[PDB]
Design a protein around this ligand. Structure first.
Ligand SMILES: CC[N+](CC)(CC)Cc1ccccc1
Ligand SMILES: [Mg+2]
Ligand SMILES: [Mg+2]
Ligand SMILES: [Mg+2]
Length: 340
């Protein structure tokens, strides 16, 4: 029962959900990882971890991934949500120094995760553990691209810290650019490749159809999060949300801003369907009767398939996850799963 302001019939009719067979063990293993890495208090892990659906989200995304790859992705992604919470709490507590030091350690750990596996900040240690494992799947050229992308992501989170401390709501276009980094568009595009077992040549992953399909998948997901997380973000004095940029800088009502965000989300779907056809045509061309061409074509088909799976996984995640159920919280402004 999706609220009509949030319901997308095209997703419900034409993007059937998919689920990785490892998900039952994935849910248990990531929960244990959160406990053993002390990324959330044990009582909050017990009450909320499964209800947050972080493993469900990724198991509906990276279909076909080796179990060990999916486990590293799920641990990294659960860490990422907890990092978003830490970021938020440092902002509302005014802990500029604590955030600066964390930001610095993540940059260093990103380049040398082994050195940081037992850092006193368990949030740094958990990052290092998941990143070191992600670095063990593909050649070092893929590792360097992941690092390059995530250095940029950290600095976008730092820009958000300064915005919220200074009381700045970004403009629409500045927000749209920033959001491709705070949502980690290019990290989760990178992770398609270990999931299908193949570092893609630049001429393949930078093909205009591959690049556009990857972009639209993430824009849909980011803007649909904006639509669904707007209530809890308004309650929490978050300022980063396409709807908030529209209300602040364009005199839209709340109902009008929600309408504009929804129509932009909808356009992502139908733009994706067009480029998806082009990307699969490119896959057909790559299958030229050679083993390498069969390998590249198969990787493109899997990766573009998972770009499509991202639509349905993100859609249902926002209605199943306790992360967004602000009407059920004792304090709408302080979600019960965050460490305050
Ligand atoms: C890993 C989660 N993420 C990615 C940067 C930060 C919170 C946003 C996200 C929210 C909801 C669904 C998917 C991704
Ligand atoms: Mg957030
Ligand atoms: Mg955030
Ligand atoms: Mg959000």
């Amino acid at each position: 029962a999706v609220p009509p302001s949030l319901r997308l019939p095209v997703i419900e009719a034409a993007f059937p959900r998919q689920l990785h067979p490892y998900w039952p063990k994935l849910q248990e293993t990531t929960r244990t990882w959160l406990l053993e890495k002390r990324l959330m208090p044990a009582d909050k892990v017990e009450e909320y971890a499964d209800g947050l659906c972080y493993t469900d989200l990724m198991a509906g995304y990276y279909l076909g991934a080796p179990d060990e790859v999916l486990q590293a992705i799920a641990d990294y992604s659960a860490w990422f949500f907890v990092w978003d919470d830490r970021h938020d709490r440092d902002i509302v507590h005014g802990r500029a120094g604590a955030w600066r030091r964390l930001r610095g350690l993540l940059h260093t750990a990103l380049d040398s995760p082994g050195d940081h596996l037992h850092h006193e900040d368990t949030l740094v240690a958990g990052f290092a553990d998941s990143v070191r494992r992600l670095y063990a799947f593909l050649p070092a050229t893929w590792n360097a691209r992941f690092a390059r992308h995530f250095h940029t992501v950290i600095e976008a989170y730092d820009r958000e810290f300064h915005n919220r401390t200074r009381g700045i709501v970004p403009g629409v276009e500045e927000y749209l650019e920033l959001r491709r980094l705070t949502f980690a568009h290019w990290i989760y595009t990178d992770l398609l490749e270990p999931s299908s077992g193949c570092e893609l040549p630049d001429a393949v992953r930078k093909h205009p159809a591959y690049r556009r399909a990857a972009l639209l998948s993430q824009e849909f997901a980011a803007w649909y999060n904006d639509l669904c997380s707007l209530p809890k973000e308004i309650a929490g004095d978050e300022v980063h949300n396409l709807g908030i940029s529209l209300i602040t800088h364009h005199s839209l009502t709340l109902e009008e801003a929600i309408g504009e965000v929804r129509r932009r989300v909808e356009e992502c779907i139908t733009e994706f369907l067009a480029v998806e056809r082009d990307a699969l045509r490119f896959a057909d061309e790559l299958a030229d009767g050679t083993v390498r061409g069969k390998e590249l074509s198969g990787a493109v088909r899997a990766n573009v398939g998972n770009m499509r799976n991202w639509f349905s996984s993100v859609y249902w995640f926002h209605h199943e996850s306790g992360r967004y159920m602000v009407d059920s919280w004792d304090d709408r402004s302080t979600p019960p799963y965050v460490n305050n």
